[PDB]
Design an enzyme around this catalytic site. Structure first.
Site, PDB file in Angstrom:
ATOM      1  N   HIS C  63       0.808  -1.225   0.000  1.00  0.00           N
ATOM      2  CA  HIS C  63       0.000   0.000   0.000  1.00  0.00           C
ATOM      3  C   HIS C  63       0.840   1.273   0.000  1.00  0.00           C
ATOM      4  O   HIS C  63       1.803   1.395   0.759  1.00  0.00           O
ATOM      5  CB  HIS C  63      -1.136  -0.001   1.042  1.00  0.00           C
ATOM      6  CG  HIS C  63      -0.709   0.230   2.464  1.00  0.00           C
ATOM      7  ND1 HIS C  63      -0.587   1.490   3.013  1.00  0.00           N
ATOM      8  CD2 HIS C  63      -0.463  -0.640   3.472  1.00  0.00           C
ATOM      9  CE1 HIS C  63      -0.251   1.385   4.286  1.00  0.00           C
ATOM     10  NE2 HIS C  63      -0.180   0.102   4.592  1.00  0.00           N
ATOM     11  N   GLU C 196      -5.440   1.565   1.951  1.00  0.00           N
ATOM     12  CA  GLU C 196      -5.361   0.423   2.873  1.00  0.00           C
ATOM     13  C   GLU C 196      -5.702   0.851   4.299  1.00  0.00           C
ATOM     14  O   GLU C 196      -6.411   0.137   5.017  1.00  0.00           O
ATOM     15  CB  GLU C 196      -3.963  -0.206   2.854  1.00  0.00           C
ATOM     16  CG  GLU C 196      -3.797  -1.495   3.715  1.00  0.00           C
ATOM     17  CD  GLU C 196      -3.464  -1.252   5.188  1.00  0.00           C
ATOM     18  OE1 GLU C 196      -3.107  -0.120   5.582  1.00  0.00           O
ATOM     19  OE2 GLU C 196      -3.546  -2.220   5.967  1.00  0.00           O
ATOM     20  N   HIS C 307       2.971   3.685  12.960  1.00  0.00           N
ATOM     21  CA  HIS C 307       2.014   4.798  12.977  1.00  0.00           C
ATOM     22  C   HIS C 307       2.538   6.011  13.743  1.00  0.00           C
ATOM     23  O   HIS C 307       1.935   6.473  14.712  1.00  0.00           O
ATOM     24  CB  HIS C 307       0.641   4.336  13.461  1.00  0.00           C
ATOM     25  CG  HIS C 307      -0.126   3.565  12.431  1.00  0.00           C
ATOM     26  ND1 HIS C 307      -1.433   3.176  12.616  1.00  0.00           N
ATOM     27  CD2 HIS C 307       0.224   3.131  11.198  1.00  0.00           C
ATOM     28  CE1 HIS C 307      -1.852   2.517  11.551  1.00  0.00           C
ATOM     29  NE2 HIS C 307      -0.867   2.479  10.674  1.00  0.00           N
TER      30      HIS C 307
END
Ligand code: ZN
Ligand code: ZN
Ligand code: ZN
Ligand code: ZN
Ligand code: ZN
Ligand code: ZN
Ligand code: ZN
Ligand code: ZN
Lengths: 346, 337, 337, 337
Positions: C63, C196, C307
């Site tokens: 992705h 994604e 993240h």
């Protein structure tokens, strides 16, 4: 037995035993349950195939609408995530497992196809996953590995089928081996149906109705049915309105669950069939839950779908409980449905 | 090694506290009678197996009662309510199968569940009955006794899982000691005691009748050698030997006996470990307070997951216990106060 | 080793979910086109790079969308309020610098802060504006996309820190696989997927169009091999190999493919470790459920601090991932279901 | 029916644990002496009433001590502080009248109150004194014993309310059994035991001296057949018969005796119910552990509101208890171990 009294065997005990005791955790159904299903159904259908994700598709040719009937052959279980220094195993759930059903329980740790070793579940001193471990009698990581255990090893409870009183049973995996049992019986009893029938033992229901989704796409049925367990909370301390279904009061005709609102024409039709043929039934609404029907009905341009359920107590444990009279009623209604579906108008 | 078929007989016989006569009593009598001079059952149901000899009088107690449940009430829809016999934790009862004992040698299955951590008011047993009357027709009454449905199985090379290793592993131990023992300078009373789990009751009454010079208990002890337990709190380790009890909450074992047992284990190269419990209690707690006092020690089989259907024990520790107890009986004539 | 300059280009191009066309799309196209027969961009913006071959049709998905922010409101004094694009943790936004994308290849700096633990109602961005009008004058609107101000840097001998290693490390991987791959008995579709992070959306649609015989995803996986984490919760370790995915919450990879991947790694002496996630989700979760089903596996690059603007990866694991995927594609013609 | 005037004498005599000699002792002796061969008071104050006969030696214990209070301190303004004798709940003491026993046969009134649910530090007794010296002049001292001011009254057709049905209802029961019993094949020792309420102390010592072949206790048991109690937790029901004790926390009654009592009750159509307590304790808990063990059973009178000035009992259950105990004594010569 009470119409103009009828003599019924109700459940084939040895067959049920075969189906509940074969291992078949989600994604790993090929390890046991798959071949049991193939062996027990192949004589009653024209063609058996297993598809790309491992769904067993048993096709009984006929002149009529294309009907899919799904019963999931995967069961919940555990997967080894880590082997501790002193040989204890850590685990992840496969499907919706409650940690409190793992404490002081015996397990079958599947080291190969058709080969297990025993394990004991315990917790570090309510429990959550970080506290759960399995003891297999190893003294070290090396010994556990010697014994056949790896990261990825699958595990089920050590459960066996037993009778409870006159009409009931206890077992591991009635969810949904009782429905696998049911479609095997429908397959035997079905004769000259005006329907193009596809019995599907689906994979990976417990992790999101995945097998039903892909098999339904492949089959492209005109009508779909799921058979699964539903909640019977007819137990002490439950308000009457929260009991959902009662054991021994009949097959459950699904109106809706969180995954599907069954086609109301099919719901009405199944109820009227049950009434006509004096088959015990009850109407089912689940506020949560989900079934293969949730995937089937959304296939392509949409598939009119219904469901029959076997009421079950203590769902998702090594000690699920079912009543043979409800199982009999489910086989009978499904059979009658398939014999009458060429007449259904939607 | 252990005698697996003998162990199986002993762990799988039913015998909840007060109701040992229902299975385990007859197993002990049958398995021990040939190795002793006399077997008697006393007023509370203790099995007292006497091997005559020339030396101090020694009582060795292994409790034959197991924890279990008793039916308190049959609900309108056929479900059973229960009370614990012994120290039962409700979280060991949920989603478990049970043997509901409707007669001697006769059982029906049951399933443990809770009402929507769980306490006793939330626990019930499902036996597949539809009504109170049906449960009663099936043979269930107020006072019906219940055990888990557990069986002996092997875990790995040296370990086992079973119901009631507490304290059938010690019952197994005294049977082996009785088989092995010959021409000891000791007057030996092997006792399979009743009602240990509800307060060492059978040991108290049997010890009184016997009036031993020396007392020993054999029981399980905590092995918390499992993930997330600090090392100082593990108590014993499986496979590291028989546990010589220094003290538990019910007894401070006679220090001369403790030291003598350790020296014997060292002298015979029997693996051993030293046990201290901060809680618990064993038959030794009743034995030593008999009459004017009885010098008492204890040996323990380390066990994981005590008071459950899945207790775990190591055969090497069992063998060491049999061996040390045998050497103790053979050498006790030399021990001085 | 790694091609650092190529890595830098891929990680630093902006491409928030749904807005990948703003930077990353063109980088992928530019960097892959010479190594395949055909590159197409589909209706939702997936980049599909096709290398013709004689064998099974194989989709490999990495992705190209990254997590980020979108402007929801411009406050009276020029501060920006934001909504997350993908799974953004508000605590990773505090006292951080941002690039506020006012056009393709144009940005203004921003600063993340909280109103006097923080939830979204407390987060705001300061762009140095004094009013709503000034913010708009500067090119900010409702809908404006924002990323962290991040750059690729080296950490020690084998490791890197960067924005969007999730999943630009996998975009980097398929680019390298495309370059290495020669005369494969497979009809190969490298796909840089869109969206994604918001639910595997591009993988779903691109997989439907391709209709592959086999599917693979390459994504990051959790490396929690950091202080205070129990060994059993670490998931993967940096530098210990490419991670072969057994399952995550979105997919149980086909066991035949899992075994085959493991045996290839062993055969070719490629470092590997086995991955199980209790949560998470990857493009493989969408691919395997395409039409009548697609047998699917996955490789992951272990990554710490997923993240965030400071994701950390090990070059050795990246190399092992490139090598195993290449071997897989060169050998898939022999794979039998 | 019950003998109302006899019952009144027995419930209204003072006799707190350890201080039974102050009233109840002489009532028992007076009411039983004519129906037995010999009455003796032992060293701790148990009344042992012996009816000679040809058969097994049987001890029947009914405890004559009642719960109460003892003066711990006299405050400056004449108020009394108290300690419990037996299991007293403070919430049964607030806004209640008491008899403060200043000599044998002599009392003054007191009033229970609390300092602004209440615990012992908040409880005091007002006797109308203005100072410590005045309280002392009135005859109060550290150690003065106190009971509630309670009297026997009728409730409806078959029920009664009183102080100390626990266990004067059993004292009444053994007096009636003694009156009824004639030419039994049993050597009978009726014992009105002391200090049951502080740990079964009198039963322990009397049982030792007597050395019975069989033991029985008669005591109250919980009847929680009242609003808001779940059916499975009611234990016994008033008017549904004498309660045959299977077990309480202090005893598991000999199962042969339990079954024999049930069969007798069935054979003579005596109303009965089966009792299991999860807590509690009775003299049977001391009796059965005497010397080498004594097979023991127990009968109970269901009682509501136990351990209060307002205990409630049903005459039909009392009569059934007298009847079953009489039949037991008449038939025990036939019972085999
Ligand atoms: Zn399920
Ligand atoms: Zn199911
Ligand atoms: Zn125990
Ligand atoms: Zn024990
Ligand atoms: Zn990713
Ligand atoms: Zn991500
Ligand atoms: Zn009391
Ligand atoms: Zn009492």
């Amino acid at each position: 037995r009470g119409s103009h009294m009828e003599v019924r065997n109700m459940v084939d005990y040895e067959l049920l035993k075969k189906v509940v005791e074969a291992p078949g955790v989600s994604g790993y159904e090929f390890l046991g349950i798959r071949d049991v299903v193939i062996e027990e159904i192949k004589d009653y259908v024209d063609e058996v195939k297993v598809d790309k994700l491992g769904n067993v598709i048993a096709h009984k040719k006929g002149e009529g609408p294309k009907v899919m009937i799904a019963a999931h052959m995967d069961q919940i279980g555990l997967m080894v995530t880590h082997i501790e220094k002193n040989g204890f195993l850590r685990v992840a759930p496969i499907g919706g497992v409650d940690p409190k059903t793992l404490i002081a329980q015996r397990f079958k740790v599947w080291i190969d196809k058709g080969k297990f070793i025993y394990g004991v579940g315990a917790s570090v001193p309510a429990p959550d996953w970080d506290q759960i471990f399995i003891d297999i009698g190893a003294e070290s990581k090396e010994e556990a590995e010697d014994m056949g255990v790896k990261i990825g090893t699958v595990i089920t409870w050590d459960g066996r089928l037993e009778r409870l009183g006159k009409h009931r049973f206890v077992s591991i995996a009635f969810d949904d081996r009782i429905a696998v049992y049911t479609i095997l019986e429908v397959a035997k009893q079905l004769k000259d149906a005006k329907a193009d029938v596809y019995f599907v033992a689906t994979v990976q229901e417990e992790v999101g109705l995945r097998g039903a989704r892909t098999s339904a796409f492949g089959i492209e049925p005109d009508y779909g049915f799921a058979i699964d367990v539903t909640i019977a909370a007819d137990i002490p301390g439950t308000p009457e309105h929260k009991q959902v279904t009662h054991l021994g009061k009949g097959t459950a005709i699904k109106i809706m669950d969180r995954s599907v609102i069954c086609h109301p024409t099919i719901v009405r039709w199944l109820e009227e069939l049950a009434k006509k043929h004096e088959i015990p039934y009850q109407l089912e609404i689940l506020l949560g839950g989900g079934t293969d029907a949730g995937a089937i009905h959304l296939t392509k341009a949409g598939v009119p779908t219904g469901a029959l359920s076997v009421p079950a107590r203590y769902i998702h444990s090594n000690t699920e409980v079912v009543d043979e009279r409800d199982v009999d009623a489910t086989v009978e209604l499904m059979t009658k449905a398939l014999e009458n579906i060429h007449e259904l108008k939607i």
